[PDB]
Design a protein around this ligand. Structure first.
Ligand SMILES: *[C@@H]1O[C@H](CO[C@@H]2O[C@@H](C)[C@@H](O)[C@@H](O)[C@@H]2O)[C@@H](O[C@@H]2O[C@H](CO)[C@@H](O)[C@H](O)[C@H]2NC(C)=O)[C@H](O)[C@H]1NC(C)=O
Ligand SMILES: *[C@@H]1O[C@H](CO[C@@H]2O[C@@H](C)[C@@H](O)[C@@H](O)[C@@H]2O)[C@@H](O[C@@H]2O[C@H](CO)[C@@H](O)[C@H](O)[C@H]2NC(C)=O)[C@H](O)[C@H]1NC(C)=O
Ligand SMILES: CCCC[N+](C)(C)[C@@H](Cc1c[nH]c2ccccc12)C(=O)NCCC1CCCCCC1
Ligand SMILES: *[C@@H]1O[C@H](CO[C@@H]2O[C@@H](C)[C@@H](O)[C@@H](O)[C@@H]2O)[C@@H](O)[C@H](O)[C@H]1NC(C)=O
Ligand SMILES: *[C@@H]1O[C@H](CO)[C@@H](O)[C@H](O)[C@H]1NC(C)=O
Ligand SMILES: *[C@@H]1O[C@H](CO)[C@@H](O)[C@H](O)[C@H]1NC(C)=O
Ligand SMILES: *[C@@H]1O[C@H](CO)[C@@H](O)[C@H](O)[C@H]1NC(C)=O
Length: 526
């Protein structure tokens, strides 16, 4: 119940899971707290300690703005931080099976939240079910989000950019140096993440600094080529300056803009983060990854195109209704509390909200490609069309393009299409299989019959957990024992993908082909 790590001993706690035991080490520090002079800088290595560190509760989550569009609504607030916000937030968690394993594959979770929100302590990121059921070690870490983790003065070490990614990376190296002491295999490490977490995984595939720190990768509903996932260097500087003016920290000396920003209280920086862009969207990522020249040596789309990335297996997928969640965060005529039937002119107003700096021709072209109904007076035509627009553009098509280009360099890739809507999903039914709601199935929450899930959901989560574990351990996401449909590799010509649902799991081909040709080839030109 105590483990000797390279910086000192840590005490865990035992947990009862499915008539068995999991040992949890919650809140192990992995860097110097980035306070004072250290704010905005790369994480600094941790100094030794002589005590026994009590790792028996989740640590502080990183400073971040909270979603307030639905106070008291579980569908919204299940994603909000469940620990104190603090700048002192660079901690990580470890779930090891009991008895202590000998050479367990390690699954490392990177949460999403648009690079502005999120925390490893969320209920749906609870790794004990994976450790219990599959004998893997689950690691998850908190990394800085928002401007505190991604403010960029390119080249300037006082705020070089990508600090949150380097937090992630320092946690990956912690697993390299220490996880063997917990019974894990540092040579069998699988990164997996969702949305901005998945985009982070994809950038670890491109970052040479991370190539020795993991084996395989799983990308759930996200990838770096998504329009929200990388900030340009023009955007980053225009945004760092706008933050400076709004905080009164404008200086000619660029580094003393940073020291001025470093004496502002965390809340003042959080308050101004939303205004650094003239017109935001429910998908704005005002402070995200940048081509810093350190974690990212070049524009990542070039690295992908020219095969500059860690050669290994990837598992990639999206959900059926990625876009709908964002519609009730700004689009007119929409509400989680009615069926959100919108008109043609509401749809058109919706495009202006999601594509504010887009020529009127571009917005007409989106409308044209999405509004030739197979039946022209289905009243929900425009409602579904806007969701599919936001989903295809922001998640599904970038994930498919990532998988194609990555697979074109010889590595096995597996693509899934998650299309099960959770029986307990607090959001309305018109929103469907929403962004983020495969996670609980991946983490095995339906395996606990105590908690309101159908038996079909238990079976689906059991299979997904097995597939994810086999992918991490073996590089092949098959369920070999229960006569399951085999999951074929995704190759650039046939582009087979596996659908994940409770009734029938099927092999299909060329997901959203005609929609993605619009977004991937034509729309980048407008
Ligand atoms: C780049 O930054 C300028 C400055 O943004 C303004 O000031 C910030 C502190 C913040 O409050 C923003 O919301 C402000 O708009 C942007 O220039 C502004 O652009 C808007 C719309 O184009 C215009 O109404 C303002 O008058 C402009 N203000 C100034 C001083 O020029 C600019 O749009 C930003 N983006 C780009 C791509 O250049
Ligand atoms: C669905 O609801 C939206 C949102 O309206 C809010 O939520 C409702 C459940 C109800 O409590 C309203 O009083 C709230 O204001 C409706 O959008 C509004 O529609 C009216 C009339 O069309 C308009 O005056 C408001 O500006 C709209 N609000 C917006 C666009 O944000 C929508 O009409 C409802 N649709 C259906 C089919 O019920
Ligand atoms: C207009 C309000 C802006 C909201 N802001 C920019 C903070 C984003 C920040 C953001 C969060 N997740 C992202 C993914 C991509 C790009 C940006 C974001 C956001 O809270 N949206 C809500 C979507 C999520 C919550 C609803 C429940 C299901 C999960 C989806
Ligand atoms: C660290 O924890 C030590 C062990 O205490 C254990 O955890 C607490 C919550 C009780 O349940 C106790 O019975 C357990 O054995 C403490 O003795 C020690 O004081 C703690 N140190 C710090 C700095 O918190
Ligand atoms: C764990 O497995 C690796 C190969 O994947 C091996 O090199 C290492 O020695 C093993 N460690 C054990 C069994 O403790
Ligand atoms: C001001 O800028 C110069 C470079 O132009 C830099 O060397 C110096 O350190 C800055 N001032 C302070 C107090 O750091
Ligand atoms: C396979 O089926 C058995 C029942 O025969 C069930 O107990 C087990 O959980 C299933 N495993 C997976 C990975 O689906």
């Amino acid at each position: 119940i105590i483990i000797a790590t390279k910086n000192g001993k840590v005490r865990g706690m035992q947990l009862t899971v499915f008539g068995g035991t999991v040992t949890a080490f919650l809140g192990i520090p992995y860097a110097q707290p980035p306070l004072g002079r250290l704010r905005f800088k790369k994480p600094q290595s941790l100094t030794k300690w002589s005590d026994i560190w009590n790792a028996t509760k989740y640590a502080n989550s990183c400073c971040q703005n909270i979603d307030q569009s639905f106070p008291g609504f579980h569908g919204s607030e299940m994603w909000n931080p469940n620990t104190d916000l603090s700048e002192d937030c660079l901690y990580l968690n470890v779930w090891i099976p009991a008895p202590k394993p000998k050479n367990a594959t390690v699954l490392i979770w990177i949460y999403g939240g648009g690079f502005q929100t999120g925390t490893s302590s969320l209920h749906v990121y609870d790794g004990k079910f994976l450790a219990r059921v599959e004998r893997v070690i689950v690691v998850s870490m908190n990394y800085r989000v928002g401007a505190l983790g991604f403010l960029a003065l390119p080249g300037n070490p006082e705020a070089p950019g990508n600090m949150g990614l380097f937090d992630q990376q320092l946690a990956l190296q912690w697993v390299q140096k220490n996880i063997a002491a917990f019974g894990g295999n540092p040579k069998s490490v699988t990164l997996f993440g969702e949305s901005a977490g998945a985009a982070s995984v994809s950038l670890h595939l491109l970052s040479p600094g991370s190539h020795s720190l993991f084996t395989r990768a799983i990308l759930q509903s996200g990838s770096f080529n998504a329009p929200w996932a990388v900030t340009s260097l023009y955007e980053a500087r225009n945004r760092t300056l706008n933050l400076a003016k709004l905080t009164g920290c404008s200086r000619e000396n660029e580094t003393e803009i940073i020291k001025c920003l470093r004496n502002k209280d965390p809340q003042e920086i959080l308050l101004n983060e939303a205004f650094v862009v003239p017109y935001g969207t429910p998908l704005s990522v005002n402070f995200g990854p940048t081509v810093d020249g350190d974690f990212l040596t070049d524009m990542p789309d070039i690295l992908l195109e020219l095969g500059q990335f860690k050669k290994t297996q990837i598992l990639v997928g999206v959900n059926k209704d990625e876009g709908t969640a964002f519609l009730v965060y700004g689009a007119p005529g929409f509400s989680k509390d009615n069926n959100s039937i919108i008109t043609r002119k509401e749809f058109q107003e919706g495009l202006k909200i999601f594509f504010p700096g887009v020529s009127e021709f571009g917005k007409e072209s989106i409308l044209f490609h999405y509004t030739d109904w197979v039946d022209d007076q289905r009243p929900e035509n425009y409602r579904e069309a806007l969701g599919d627009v936001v989903g295809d553009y922001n998640f599904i098509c970038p994930a498919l393009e990532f998988t194609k280009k990555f697979s074109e360099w010889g590595n096995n890739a597996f693509f899934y299409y998650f299309e099960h809507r959770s029986s307990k999903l607090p959001w309305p039914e018109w929103m469907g299989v929403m962004h983020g709601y495969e996670i609980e199935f991946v983490f095995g929450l339906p395996l606990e019959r105590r908690d309101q899930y159908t038996k079909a959901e238990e079976i689906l989560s059991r299979s997904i957990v097995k597939r994810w574990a086999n992918f991490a351990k073996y590089g092949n996401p098959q369920e070999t024992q229960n006569q399951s449909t085999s999951w074929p590799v995704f190759k650039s010509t046939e582009q087979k993908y596996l659908t994940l649902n409770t009734e029938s799991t099927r092999i299909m081909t060329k997901l959203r082909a005609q929609q993605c040709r619009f977004w991937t080839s034509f729309f980048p030109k407008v």
